[PDB]
Each structure stands twice: as structure tokens, then as C-alpha cells.
Write an enzyme that holds these catalytic residues in place. Structure first.
Site, short mmCIF file in Angstrom:
data_model
loop_
_atom_site.label_atom_id
_atom_site.label_comp_id
_atom_site.label_asym_id
_atom_site.label_seq_id
_atom_site.Cartn_x
_atom_site.Cartn_y
_atom_site.Cartn_z
N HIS A 238 0.79 -1.23 0.00
CA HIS A 238 0.00 0.00 0.00
C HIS A 238 0.83 1.28 0.00
O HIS A 238 0.52 2.21 -0.75
CB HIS A 238 -0.98 -0.01 1.18
CG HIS A 238 -1.93 -1.16 1.15
ND1 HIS A 238 -2.76 -1.47 2.20
CD2 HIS A 238 -2.17 -2.10 0.20
CE1 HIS A 238 -3.46 -2.55 1.90
NE2 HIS A 238 -3.12 -2.95 0.69
N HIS B 131 -9.21 -2.23 -5.40
CA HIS B 131 -8.13 -2.46 -4.46
C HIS B 131 -7.07 -3.38 -5.06
O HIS B 131 -5.87 -3.18 -4.84
CB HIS B 131 -8.64 -3.06 -3.14
CG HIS B 131 -7.56 -3.21 -2.12
ND1 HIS B 131 -7.16 -2.17 -1.31
CD2 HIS B 131 -6.70 -4.23 -1.86
CE1 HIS B 131 -6.10 -2.54 -0.60
NE2 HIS B 131 -5.81 -3.79 -0.93
N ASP C 283 -3.10 -2.77 -5.25
CA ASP C 283 -2.05 -3.69 -4.80
C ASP C 283 -1.02 -3.97 -5.90
O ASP C 283 0.18 -3.97 -5.66
CB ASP C 283 -2.64 -5.04 -4.37
CG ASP C 283 -3.21 -5.03 -2.96
OD1 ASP C 283 -2.91 -4.10 -2.19
OD2 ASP C 283 -3.95 -5.97 -2.62
N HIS D 157 -0.59 -11.10 -5.04
CA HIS D 157 0.79 -10.70 -4.83
C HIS D 157 1.80 -11.69 -5.43
O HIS D 157 2.75 -11.27 -6.08
CB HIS D 157 1.08 -10.52 -3.35
CG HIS D 157 0.30 -9.42 -2.72
ND1 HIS D 157 0.40 -8.10 -3.13
CD2 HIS D 157 -0.63 -9.43 -1.74
CE1 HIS D 157 -0.43 -7.36 -2.43
NE2 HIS D 157 -1.07 -8.14 -1.57
ZN LIG Z 1 -3.96 -4.52 -0.41
#
Ligand SMILES: [Zn+2]
Ligand SMILES: CCCCCCCOc1cccc(C(=O)O)c1
Ligand SMILES: CCCCCCCOc1cccc(C(=O)O)c1
Ligand SMILES: [Cl-]
Ligand SMILES: [Zn+2]
Ligand SMILES: [Zn+2]
Ligand SMILES: [Zn+2]
Ligand SMILES: [Zn+2]
Lengths: 267, 267
Positions: B73, B225, B229, B252
């Protein structure tokens, strides 16, 4: 037994599970015949059924514009230890929830009991009584000792569970934590409640899972908690209770309803 | 654009979403060519892919025995604002999660930008590339501007949703909060994570319900969101990125995998 109070004042602080606000209570000693009462912003609120103002998701007491939410747990512990004369000063609008059980209350109070001079005038159930409400049912009847059985019928992996408390087994229920099903959390938050809830003070159950990493303290912790709740609500009769109760899917609303009808019969 | 840093030290603090511990950040100004880096217990940890040590549920970095969790973030905000030279000092083991979005970081840093004396040396995707992983896929290709699209295929009411960020629309994604489905809460907790999670920093979604009383800021806040990310993970390439990206169900792990392969091809 004899009426009891606390040797010295005891205090507890934390967050209210519903308000989500800081809360703290101070338990002060009181002479014989005083009874149990809360004190908030200059007003004394007797721990009695006549002062109940809400029973959805907790038992709340109110008087003269002053309300205190969630008294069931501190009252249950006081009922189990037979503490009969104390003044519970309240800071905030709800009793701290702590870890969701009566453990901290129980351990602290237990080691600070003070015997007084006057035998307890117990509220003795004199005849059978039954209150019902949409499948839910609670029955009470005479008994020389407090005995409480709760039977639940859950729509999740818990299915049908049953648990029975009898005098001397206090430790089997003072550890049972508050619980809630994931599918009811949305509603609770929506109606302005559960603002202080967390996995730290609430056992959250899914259809076939337990969210809390610590799991259940007992395979039937929920019904043990319900017995704990009922014992707290029963103390709203004004004094330690002696009777046999069986609750089938009961809740605070039904518990209080029972208490009010038992009171009418002038036991 | 010119390289940038902050005018003066900026600080942030709060609980980490995973460790559940209180942390503090101090963003220090740095000269041209320094790059983005963290600082913990006397150790500098470059915000680059070679230092990634964990990607499940967050992007964590480490070097010489010092680890910092959840850097996506703050890195995303720094990437969007083109802050290229700063040292993020962390007193703790994780970046504060705050409200779960990049809003607070964005608002403060944006009002304290200091252009510097050097043209940013952008990482420019030179040729098309694709990385896959059991259904998940991320595609990257040449573009003069940073363009990032994320497509989600959710197993709840969200269903199939898509969102595209293009330069200039930063404010459409810096507010999207962190989210998680209720069915994965149990897992996250059991593997030692999410110790600081709550409805205050996390959007919890059910099969067809949003637990948070405040609801969603956008009907597609979750994909927004995910875009946020990814932009954070892309900054691990070492410098602001220029390229067109498309992520289908990425996370991720896949993001970092994309970054590593892009770096190998020295693209
Ligand atoms: Zn996040
Ligand atoms: C009948 C008693 C109902 C008590 C409801 C407690 C609120 O439930 C939660 C559980 C876990 C996390 C949260 C949160 O807000 O993060 C709320
Ligand atoms: C993308 C990774 C997210 C990790 C956070 C998981 C969310 O966790 C919670 C939500 C609500 C309440 C609680 C609690 O403990 O009461 C924990
Ligand atoms: Cl994991
Ligand atoms: Zn006092
Ligand atoms: Zn309700
Ligand atoms: Zn209870
Ligand atoms: Zn995991």
C-alpha cells in the site's frame, strides 16, 4: 448461606461489546439487606426485572433516563457466588465484555468474598411454570438447589446439544464465551449493536467452521454460555434462586419473560 | 517527469493488519538517485523484487535478518505520486494498515512533494509478456502511460467485475479498502496472520452479503483495491513503471512473479 459482599472494591475495564465504547465498573461493598444495584450518572438502578428495557442481544437495565447494557454476565457471576449486597458503579453505557465469559469477574470476586450477618432469603420456585414463544420454551419447578439445563438446536455443525449446571460446577460455565453465527453478524451491526465485538470477545461460528483460531473451549461451549446467560437473567428476581430450569432454545427475551411471570406468582 | 522526494519528514502509525502490533513509519527525504528503500534496525531494505520474502496475503521484504510486512500500500501510493527517493524508516515489523486503503498516505505525501533535479528513469516494458498460474494470469505490454486493469471472477455476489486505472485517475483507487471473504478468515488466522484485522481496516464479504455496516464505497471496490495492490507490487521493479497491464485473478504471488520475469528480460 449468609448474605455476602466484597472485602474491598473491585474494578474492571474494557470495551462494551455493543457500544464499542470504553467501559468500566467498580464494585463497592454494601451493608446487609442492600441488594444489588448499579450506579450511573447519579442514578441507582436496582438489578431487578422491573428495570429491564431491552432483551435483544443482551439484557439492559434502565431508570430515569440512564441505561446500562449487557448486565447478564456480571450478574450471573454474582448469582453463582451468591454476592447479595454491592453497588456497581458504571462508567460508560455498558458493562465491559472482557473476553466474553464470566471468568475474569469470577476469579477476582471469588477471592474477595465477605460473609455478612443475615441468612439469605432465597427466591424459591414454589410450583411448575412454563413460558413459550415460537418453538422456544423454558420450564421451572421446585428444587432445593439451583439446577439449569439448556438445550439448543443449531442450524450448523453443532446440531442438537444439551448441558446441565448444578451447584458446585460453577467453573464449567464461567469460562463459556459469548458466541454468534457469521450469518447474524451483518444484522447485529446494521441495527446499531455489536460495535465492540471481535474474535477476542466473541466465538464466531459458521455453518461448518469456527472462525476463532483458538477454537472452542468445549465442544458444547455455546449451550454452556446460554446456561450462564440464564443464570444472570434469573438474578433479576431480586435474590439468589433455588429451582430447576430447563430451557429449549431460550434467549434473554424469554428468560426475562419467565422471570416476570415467576415474580407475579409472588414466590 | 522529474524525480521526487518529500519536503520534510512525514510520520504515520497504527496497528499492522497481520502482526496485530503497533508500528510507526517515518518517511525521510533523500537525494537524487537514492531510490525507494525501507530502514529497520540499522538495515536498509531496497523496495525491489530481490528482497521479497513472502507474498501470501501481503508483500513482505527482508534483508540481513530484518523483515517488514505489508509494503504494497505505501509502495503503491509512492508509485502513483512518482516519489522516487525516500527512506521509509519502520519502527516495528509491519507497515501500519490504517483504514486499509492508501488514502491517508496519499493525502499527506501529495501535499509534500518536492520535485528534484533529475528526469525519472522509468522501467519501460519493451515487449509483451505473460505469466500464468492455475487459471490466474497477468499480461504486460508496451505503453507510454501506466495502465492497469484487473479482472476478478468472484465466487460470491461480486461475480465477474473489471476495473481500469489510467494515469490521472489516482483518486479512484487510493480509497479502495483491503478486503477478504469470510471463508478465508479462519485460514488466515490459523497460519499466524491477520492478527490486527477488523471491520475498521478490512472489508469482509460473504456469499452474498457485506458484513461491514458502512457497506462498499464502490460496487467494485474489491477490484479497485486489487489494482492498487498490483501498482504497489510493480514498483518493486525499482522505478516508476510505464506499461499496459492486465491481471485476471492475480494476487501478490503472481504480481511478483511478473515483476521478476520482467526484470530478468531487463525489459
Ligand atoms: Zn492490499
Ligand atoms: C448475541 C451477542 C452478539 C454479539 C455480537 C459481536 C459482534 O460480532 C463480531 C465478531 C467478530 C468481529 C467483529 C468486528 O466488528 O470486527 C464483530
Ligand atoms: C488481505 C488480508 C486481510 C487479512 C485480515 C483478515 C480480516 O480479519 C478480520 C476481520 C474482521 C474481524 C476480525 C477480528 O479478529 O475480530 C478479523
Ligand atoms: Cl498462507
Ligand atoms: Zn467508586
Ligand atoms: Zn436483532
Ligand atoms: Zn452472554
Ligand atoms: Zn494463506
Amino acid at each position: 448461606g449468609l448474605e455476602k459482599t466484597v472485602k474491598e472494591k473491585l474494578s474492571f475495564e474494557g470495551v462494551g461489546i455493543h457500544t464499542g465504547e470504553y467501559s468500566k465498573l467498580i464494585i463497592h461493598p454494601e451493608k446487609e439487606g442492600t441488594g444489588i444495584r448499579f450506579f450511573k450518572n447519579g442514578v441507582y438502578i436496582p438489578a431487578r426485572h422491573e428495570f429491564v428495557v431491552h432483551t435483544n442481544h443482551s439484557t439492559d437495565l434502565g431508570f430515569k433516563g440512564q441505561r446500562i447494557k449487557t448486565v447478564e454476565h456480571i450478574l450471573s457471576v454474582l448469582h453463582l457466588l451468591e454476592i447479595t449486597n454491592v453497588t456497581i458503579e458504571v462508567i460508560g453505557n455498558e458493562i465491559p465484555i472482557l473476553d466474553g465469559s464470566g471468568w475474569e469477574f469470577y476469579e477476582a470476586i471469588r477471592k474477595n468474598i465477605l460473609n455478612q450477618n443475615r441468612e439469605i432469603d432465597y427466591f424459591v420456585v414454589e410450583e411448575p411454570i412454563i413460558v413459550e414463544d415460537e418453538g422456544r420454551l423454558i420450564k421451572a419447578e421446585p428444587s432445593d438447589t439451583l439446577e439449569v439445563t439448556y438445550e439448543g438446536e443449531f442450524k450448523n455443525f453443532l446440531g442438537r446439544q444439551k448441558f446441565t449446571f448444578v451447584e458446585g460446577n460453577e467453573e464449567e460455565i464461567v469460562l463459556a464465551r459469548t458466541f454468534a453465527f457469521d450469518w447474524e453478524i451483518e444484522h447485529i451491526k446494521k441495527v446499531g449493536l455489536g460495535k465492540g465485538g471481535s474474535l477476542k470477545n466473541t466465538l464466531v461460528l459458521g455453518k461448518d467452521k469456527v472462525y476463532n483460531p483458538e477454537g472452542l473451549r468445549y465442544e458444547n461451549e455455546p449451550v454452556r454460555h446460554k446456561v450462564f446467560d440464564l443464570i444472570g437473567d434469573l438474578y433479576l428476581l431480586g435474590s439468589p434462586v433455588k429451582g430447576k430450569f430447563y430451557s429449549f432454545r431460550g434467549g434473554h427475551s424469554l428468560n426475562v419473560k419467565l422471570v416476570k411471570e415467576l415474580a407475579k406468582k409472588q414466590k
